[PDB]
Curated annotation (Swiss-Prot), chain B:
tRNA-binding domain span: 12-112
Superkingdom assignment: Archaea
Quaternary data: Homodimer.
Compartmental location: Cytoplasm
Similarity field: Belongs to the class-I aminoacyl-tRNA synthetase family. MetG type 1 subfamily.
Protein name stated in the entry: Methionine--tRNA ligase
Length: 111, 112
């Protein structure tokens, strides 16, 4: 992949990246490639739309520890409000959601 | 654009080049007793990082670990050693958990 121009640490600092846990996954009722994903941050939950249906079955996602951007502005995706986004690596062959390497408290901040 | 205060757009994330890498070497920082010098492979380039992981991970447990690197940060000199990036880790104040892809995907894979 291509090398990017350099940015400030302060640009990374703008993101509120957190560990969450997937609680429920359903097909997006109007978009065949998308899931509606309910993520727990502990005492809060967020509902996101993710383009993961081609890569993960719904039962492979339940209980998964994931990483989300927690201060993303909400967006309407074909009738569903998405409150954030999950992070996943992609090399064109596979898509790999990011995870902490240990169970850690939900809502933990990534830094 | 209109001020958004504490909220970000996708473009604020897209500014950051986040990659999967693999740790290929870990050494003690010669001027800082809590820090490691960590060499991370992106496949056909490597980056040298300084990480405060010595209190949480043994060197031999980091070798071969698939990690998540911010790959386009400005460099930073930490007590004589230039760090070229940073690894992402979850921290709840009790425990530190490096992020990893959930499978050993190709080195240099970009996060989206």
């Amino acid at each position: 992949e291509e090398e990017y121009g350099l940015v400030s640490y302060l640009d990374f600092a703008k993101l509120d990246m957190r560990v969450g846990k997937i609680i429920d996954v359903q097909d997006h009722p109007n978009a065949d490639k998308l899931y509606i994903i309910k993520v727990s941050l502990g005492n809060k939950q967020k509902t996101l739309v993710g383009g993961l249906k081609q890569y993960y079955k719904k039962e492979e996602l339940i209980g998964k520890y994931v990483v989300l951007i927690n201060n993303l502005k909400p967006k309407q995706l074909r009738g569903i409000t998405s409150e954030g986004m999950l992070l996943a690596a992609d090399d064109g062959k596979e898509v790999a959601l990011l995870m902490p390497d240990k169970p850690i408290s939900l809502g933990s901040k990534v830094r």
